[PDB]
Design an enzyme around this catalytic site. Structure first.
Site, PDB file in Angstrom:
ATOM      1  N   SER A 111       0.858  -1.181   0.000  1.00  0.00           N
ATOM      2  CA  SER A 111       0.000   0.000   0.000  1.00  0.00           C
ATOM      3  C   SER A 111       0.895   1.232   0.000  1.00  0.00           C
ATOM      4  CB  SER A 111      -0.938   0.001   1.204  1.00  0.00           C
ATOM      5  OG  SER A 111      -1.708   1.187   1.248  1.00  0.00           O
ATOM      6  N   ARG A 112       1.046   1.857  -1.169  1.00  0.00           N
ATOM      7  CA  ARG A 112       1.939   3.006  -1.289  1.00  0.00           C
ATOM      8  C   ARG A 112       1.436   4.194  -0.480  1.00  0.00           C
ATOM      9  NH1 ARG A 112       2.612   2.543  -7.940  1.00  0.00           N
ATOM     10  NH2 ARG A 112       2.869   0.269  -7.898  1.00  0.00           N
ATOM     11  N   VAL A 113       0.134   4.456  -0.525  1.00  0.00           N
ATOM     12  CA  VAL A 113      -0.419   5.621   0.154  1.00  0.00           C
ATOM     13  C   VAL A 113      -0.775   5.312   1.607  1.00  0.00           C
ATOM     14  CG1 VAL A 113      -2.362   7.228   0.137  1.00  0.00           C
ATOM     15  CG2 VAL A 113      -1.200   6.657  -1.994  1.00  0.00           C
TER      16      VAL A 113
END
Lengths: 470, 56, 119, 478, 121, 478
Positions: F341-343
């Site tokens: 999950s980048r964000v």
């Protein structure tokens, strides 16, 4: 006047021109009936299906038979509706082609009988059932380890000589006996000799009186090979809707249906997709399968044999087919030699219905325990094969003892096999199967010999046979 | 010496069995890629043929 | 720009040696997968031993990646990089575990990480 | 009112387009101005696409085209027996004309599903491997597939010759073959005496594409005449891949949409239409039967190609020939691992059924363990015995060219092999053992031979064992 | 070249030899000209008339009652792909095969003809 | 009259072509005499290309086409909640019509660079594995990717159900799904009470390709109306792969040239135009947000395919479902190697950030240590404790079907784990321990639960340890 004229004949593709403002609709059926006017003509009786509107009052159609002898300018008459196939009690015990004409030699159906269109929209979202129900087939292995869902699609895998036809006949017999519902068999692209053999088997098994049979010969044009499945499905829909009963539908090979669709698209000249298949493959498969559902006053469930091209399960045709399946049964040659006549692999077969919310917590637990025991025996087999028997621990010995009993109890005696064995068939309720398998898992019948568990039916038959033999 | 010879033979047998298992796993992992490449090649060939036909 | 007259003779030699040992390790991959480490010659064991550590030391922690992992990040000068890789190639750090080379930066951070782990 | 006449517009590559011909039929036979025949295939709105059945170099734009009014048909009758004939019905040998009385169209409906009967009559090809592992029944159509240099023509010639006394009419169709090879094949058949019950249809490589396309249908139409009279017919297509290639060429020249590998959409329809006319008729229909042996040529042995896939899906079985096996001196070169007969069992006599299973098991074991034969240090009990049995099995399955073997002798020799009587005979002397066993049989085992021939079942086991032991007593080992 | 040999086969009635430097280029040139002539492409971009062209070329090399023509045709397989349509069509006419071995040439066994790779019906 | 009325020329395969309609504009809706709506794509010199949005059987050449004056639009409003509709907004479930009074365009620009804000609010899915390892924030585009029959729809249904008490509006879009499956899903949602705040958009496989191509845009257009009013919307696209297949079919029917895997050139633009409309609006724009959970189906777990790569290159992370480890059946196994999950992380609550860090390391160590096939060394510190911890973590990460868990209880159970409070309890009792612990918590630890709910930080550690020890004392080990 609704009279058309032939203007182009290119193989199985025929173009017809009509008077302005009177073109037939898509999927309509056109008839050509010509009599030889002289010695340079031949008699013709051909049926066409409308596919496209090319403009200038011209319609492109695909023939249902050979186009030899066609002459530009021949009269074409529009029937005003798609292909119509007779439905009702008159179709039971009969053999039909794609056009709905009888194939056997018992005579023609009267022209006043009710007929239904081949093409029909799928049932509305309003009419579908709101819950999932289990179709009790009466076969122990199927009812336990891979339950069937009313309105669902079941994929059947197996070769020749493994019991496919016997399983089909037993399913038809059990469904007709315990649910009062008829079955329909649709042969798509089958081999003619194999179809004749199956017809004779169903004839001498006493099963043909409860089924309607449709064959699309492998020499038939792609249009026929593509519409045979719809003919069978619309034969079954009448009994789903009007008689309000649960009906079976068998398809000989759906991959041949997709192949026929691809050939039709190639003939029509549409640009190919994927691995050379038609661009409309997904929507064609959806239009075929979405009509096999369980409504509020009936259900149609389908058993479909599937062929995997080049053993590639990621090929577009099997990949699209698998997105509609709800269950899967595999017939095993190894079990065939071992002597389990149903020959269904207890580990390869899977079903979406094997969940606690559907079959019940007790059923789920028993099925999981049986699968775990069979798997454990599967790993142990190599240890027994290579190392000594004494290397097995006490629990391993007990597991090996239980697994053979379970595997032999998964076998069953069929009503179809009576004509070859003498002993009658048996219908086993799902609750009785669950109780018997739970009792076996509890060790309640360890002392009984493993040969007492073969071809019995219910659990009491095992102890009765054991007492009879000793 | 006899014990050592027996141990050597058993070790060679076990090593060969492990090698066969690894080879079979490699074979199946390669067959997956073979199927993918076969599909890609068929798609490319049919696309080129159809484009050439349409060019006329 | 990777030329002896641009980056320097020592830099060029270290880079060429690293590429050579990495290529040898890549070549040995099929034999490693099939038979395992047991069948490699005596020097091939050393080649694999050095190559794994070199590959792990090529990694780095970034300043922009702090918000996702908490590692403050590092900025390694080229002279420090060349010295560390030359020391690794010479076999100075053959005893340390390969996980100590993972995401450190300078060569001294490898020793600090190994000592923290308990070597 | 230009209805029966037309004028040429375009000429090239064996395809001509003509204006007019309003009343021409699809698939009709059409005659050009200079006498070259043609066939109408594309009935377009304002022109007709005509394929040319001969040398098209003499046709120019503006030539007159005459409509004949006859659907493409071929002569049929007993007068064609012993003749070499092109697909149009014209003899190609110099022996003279043919006196056929009636003709039938090349395109005809196949027998219905209710007019057929299950295949139950064996067709003896005279080859031990085929008759034991992949039996062929009358009415079944079986595919023989393999690369070149595998003797598919040799198999076809042997199985045609073996029908000398079995009361069967044979038809040999050569598509895309070399005329020299066809001539040598005809001479071989004449020498062995098969020309008095066989017909040869030839369409060589130099011939126009429509002739190659039409040849199999001409052969099947000729066969159906005898088939519907209550007789039994055997039809061999020497190569279906070349017929498919010719059809692809014609379709591409007619600018029809191309499919996979540039083949038209109806190539599968073409092949299924051709191969669905071979069937075993019911008793009400006269009891006749027609069997087909199509050939498919592969490159580097890839059965995954489009045409081989279609033919395999269509047919009832396959016989696979292997290039390495052929190179290894095994003349039949039949790979039993990949070969299959979906009708097998029902197409065998009781004597052959009683013996074939053990032979199949032994061959399977030997094929499994063949790669490790050069290790004499293996398990002295299992592996050595399996290898010793498999070597003798392979030696037994070998056969000489143009020398078919009677089914009774095949049964006896396979029984002798499978009962262990050959375990002491050397592998190099197995062939000589077989030859002198046949001689000993035809000398003094006439009672056993007659019993097998007249009952289709094995004779007394003790008598057979005594005969085998008596022969082994007089056999000499090198 | 074939006509030049046919004269001696027919009139003089003697057995002659016909050597072809490379038979693959004969099909390649037709494949090149087919697109400009205006024909639809074949499977691998070749001409749709490949088989009939090759047959009309090869079938004139035959033995007759008087004389004969036998042909030695050097064949080049691009990238050793034996499934290519041109070699596939060419191989259907061959009767024999001779392979020259650089290993034998180095060993000094002239003509360096491979004794195992060579085959003949 | 051709200014506003047209006449159909060609009909076929769901694409029409009409003459006239001089005043029609690109992207306008047109209505046939049959009542079936259509969309005008191409405005050629003398004809207009029209795509039929429905059954094209009833349309024939010569029929009239009538302008509507509206660019492609869908109805939207509060009246659409609790209903099942098609991409055109027509009710499908019955229950009477829909009383919406506003419309939105299908093709709308995405929020600009200056209109967006960083994601800082958590989206609670109610699934322990997702909420612990791959957190999802409001305004994030998270891809759920996996093979067939791996419970992706079950995950979506659980996520939708968990939004009961939160100020969230759910929109479920089904593309190419079975109508019976959609019916069962709607019934389950009604049973659990999610119909009070959810909208269902359906397009079965039997529907024509244009409806499947248009469904996701209709869903996002419905979501944007709530998003721009300051509310929060969750949108679930069920098969972007099926939408891409439908678009490929339409493009190939329009004779457009294909590319990689026969897909059109703008297949990436098709998905980007849709997925770029989900964003977190800034305080100036209103503070609303729309979050999307697209689904992509792989073949044999290959994430290197064209469509999976295209979707990965757009979203803010992906969750990979492991088919082989889906053997547990009840819950899919999230492959921590590929899932990311980048964000997320910034949106995760404070307690979860404190607790899940060591759980991540424990799971990674267990997964790297496993697959040793029962090694014999069994070093204590390196193997035994790590394997026990990993087994307990795997048992904890399991979940029951349709049983979302509140975030406070998730935090408490994951804190009970990873602190040694479970290393004595056998792994086969972990689930029962978790259930009993939840009962004990909601019976007595109301102060801890209220602390977690009021502030996102952990309660007093000594009090939490005392409560856990008291429950352990009260718990009986099987």
């Amino acid at each position: 006047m609704t009279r058309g004229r032939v203007i182009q004949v290119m193989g199985p593709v025929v173009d017809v021109k009509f008077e302005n403002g009177h073109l037939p609709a898509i999927y309509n059926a056109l008839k050509i009936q010509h009599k030889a006017r002289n010695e340079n003509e031949v008699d013709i009786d051909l049926t066409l299906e409308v596919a496209l509107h090319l403009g200038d009052d011209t319609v492109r159609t695909i023939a249902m038979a050979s186009t030899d002898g066609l002459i530009r300018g021949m009269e074409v008459i529009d029937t005003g509706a798609p292909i119509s196939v007779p439905v009702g009690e008159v179709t039971l015990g009969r053999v039909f082609n794609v056009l709905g004409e009888p194939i056997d030699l018992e005579g023609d159906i009267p022209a006043d009988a009710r007929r239904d269109p081949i093409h029909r929209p799928a049932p509305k979202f309003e009419e579908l059932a709101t819950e999932v129900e289990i179709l009790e087939t009466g076969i122990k292995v199927v009812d336990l380890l891979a339950p069937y869902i009313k309105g669902g699609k079941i994929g059947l895998f197996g070769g020749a000589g493994v019991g496919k036809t016997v399983l089909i006949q037993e399913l038809i017999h059990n469904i007709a006996q315990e649910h009062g519902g008829i079955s329909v068999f649709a042969g798509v692209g089958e081999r003619t000799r194999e179809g004749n053999d199956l017809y004779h088997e169903m004839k001498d098994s006493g099963v043909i009186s409860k089924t309607a049979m449709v064959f699309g010969q492998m020499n038939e044009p792609p249009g026929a090979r593509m519409r045979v499945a719809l003919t069978g499905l619309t034969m079954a829909e009448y009994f789903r809707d009007e008689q309000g009963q649960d009906v079976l539908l068998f398809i000989d090979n759906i991959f041949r249906f997709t192949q026929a669709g691809s050939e039709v698209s190639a003939l029509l000249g549409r640009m190919p997709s994927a691995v050379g298949y038609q661009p409309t493959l997904a929507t064609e498969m959806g239009q075929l399968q979405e009509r096999i559902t369980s409504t509020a006053k009936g259900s149609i469930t389908s058993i479909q044999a599937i062929y995997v091209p080049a053993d590639d399960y990621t090929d577009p045709a099997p990949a699209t087919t698998f997105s509609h399946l709800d269950a899967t049964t595999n017939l095993e040659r190894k079990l065939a030699e071992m002597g389990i006549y149903p020959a269904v692999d207890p580990l390869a077969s899977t079903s979406r219905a094997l969940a606690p919310e559907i079959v019940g917590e007790e059923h789920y637990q028993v099925a999981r325990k049986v699968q775990q025991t069979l798997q454990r025996y599967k790993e142990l087999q190599d240890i027994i094969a290579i190392l000594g028997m004494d290397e097995l621990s006490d629990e391993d010995k007990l597991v090996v003892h239980r697994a053979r009993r379970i595997q032999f109890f998964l076998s069953q005696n069929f009503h179809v096999a009576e004509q070859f064995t003498g002993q009658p068939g048996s219908y086993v309720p799902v609750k009785e199967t669950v109780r018997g398998f739970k009792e076996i898992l509890e060790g309640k019948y360890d002392h009984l010999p493993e040969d007492a568990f073969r071809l019995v039916g219910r659990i009491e038959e095992v102890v009765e046979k054991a007492k009879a033999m000793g | 010496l006899l014990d050592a010879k027996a141990s050597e033979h058993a070790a060679r047998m076990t090593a060969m069995k492990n090698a066969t298992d690894n080879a079979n796993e490699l074979i199946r992992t390669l067959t997956l890629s073979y199927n993918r490449a076969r599909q890609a090649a068929i798609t490319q060939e049919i696309t080129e043929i159809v484009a050439g036909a349409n060019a006329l | 720009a990777l030329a002896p007259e641009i980056v320097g003779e020592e830099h060029y030699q270290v880079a060429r040696k690293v590429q050579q040992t990495l290529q040898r390790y890549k070549e040995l991959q099929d034999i490693i997968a099939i038979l395992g480490m047991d069948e490699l010659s005596d020097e091939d064991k050393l080649v694999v031993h050095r190559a794994r550590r070199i590959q792990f030391f090529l990694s780095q922690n970034f300043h922009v990646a702090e918000q996702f992992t908490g590692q403050p990040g590092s900025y390694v000068p080229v002279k420090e990089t060349v010295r560390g890789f030359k020391e690794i190639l010479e076999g100075k750090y053959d005893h340390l575990p390969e996980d100590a080379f993972r995401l450190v930066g300078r060569i001294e951070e490898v020793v600090e990480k190994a000592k923290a782990m308990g070597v | 009112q230009v209805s029966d006449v037309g004028t040429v517009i375009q000429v090239g590559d064996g395809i001509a387009r003509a204006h007019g011909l309003d009343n021409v039929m699809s698939g009709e036979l059409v005659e050009f101005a200079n006498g070259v025949m043609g066939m109408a295939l594309n009935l377009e709105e304002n022109n007709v696409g005509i394929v040319i059945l001969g040398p098209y170099t003499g046709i120019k734009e503006g030539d007159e085209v005459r409509r004949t009014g006859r659907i493409m048909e071929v002569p049929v009758g007993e007068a064609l027996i012993g003749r070499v004939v092109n697909p149009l019905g014209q003899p190609v040998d110099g022996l003279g004309p043919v006196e056929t009385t009636e003709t039938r169209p090349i395109e005809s409906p196949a027998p219905g599903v209710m007019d057929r009967r299950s295949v139950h009559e064996p067709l003896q090809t005279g080859i031990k491997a085929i008759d034991a592992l992949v039996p062929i029944g009358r009415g079944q159509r079986e595919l023989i597939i393999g690369d070149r240099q595998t003797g598919k023509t040799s198999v076809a010639i042997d199985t045609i010759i073996n029908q000398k006394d079995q009361n069967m009419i044979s038809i040999y169709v050569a598509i895309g073959q070399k005329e020299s090879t066809v001539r040598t094949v005809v001479e071989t058949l004449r020498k062995h005496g098969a020309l008095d019950y066989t017909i040869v249809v030839t369409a060589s490589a130099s011939q126009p594409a429509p002739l190659l396309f039409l040849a199999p249908y001409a052969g099947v139409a000729m066969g159906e005449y005898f088939m519907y009279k209550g007789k039994h017919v055997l039809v061999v297509y020497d190569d279906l891949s070349k017929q498919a290639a010719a059809y692809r060429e014609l379709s591409l020249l007619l600018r029809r949409p191309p499919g996979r590998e540039a083949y038209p959409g109806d190539i599968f329809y073409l092949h299924s239409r051709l191969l669905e006319r071979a069937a075993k008729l019911s008793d009400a229909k006269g009891g006749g039967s027609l069997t087909a042996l199509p050939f498919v040529e592969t490159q580097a042995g890839d059965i995954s190609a489009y045409i081989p896939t279609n033919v395999i899906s269509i047919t009832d079985g396959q016989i696979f020939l292997q290039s390495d096996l052929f190179f290894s001196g095994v003349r039949p070169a039949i790979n039993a691992g990949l070969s299959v007969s979906r009708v097998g069992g029902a197409a065998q006599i009781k004597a052959m059924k009683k013996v074939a299973g053990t032979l199949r098991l032994d061959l399977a074991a030997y094929r499994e363990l063949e790669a490790f034969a050069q290790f004499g240090s293996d398990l002295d009990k299992a592996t050595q015995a399996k290898l010793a049995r498999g070597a003798r099995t392979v030696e037994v399955l070998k056969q000489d060219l143009h020398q078919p073997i009677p089914v009774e002798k095949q049964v006896l020799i396979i029984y002798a092999l499978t009962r262990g009587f050959l375990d002491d005979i050397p592998v190099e002397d197995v062939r000589r053992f077989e030859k002198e066993f046949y001689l000993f049989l035809d000398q003094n085992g006439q009672h056993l031979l007659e019993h097998i021939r007249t009952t289709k079942d094995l004779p007394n086991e003790d008598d057979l064992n005594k005969a085998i032991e008596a022969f082994k007593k007089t056999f000499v080992v090198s």
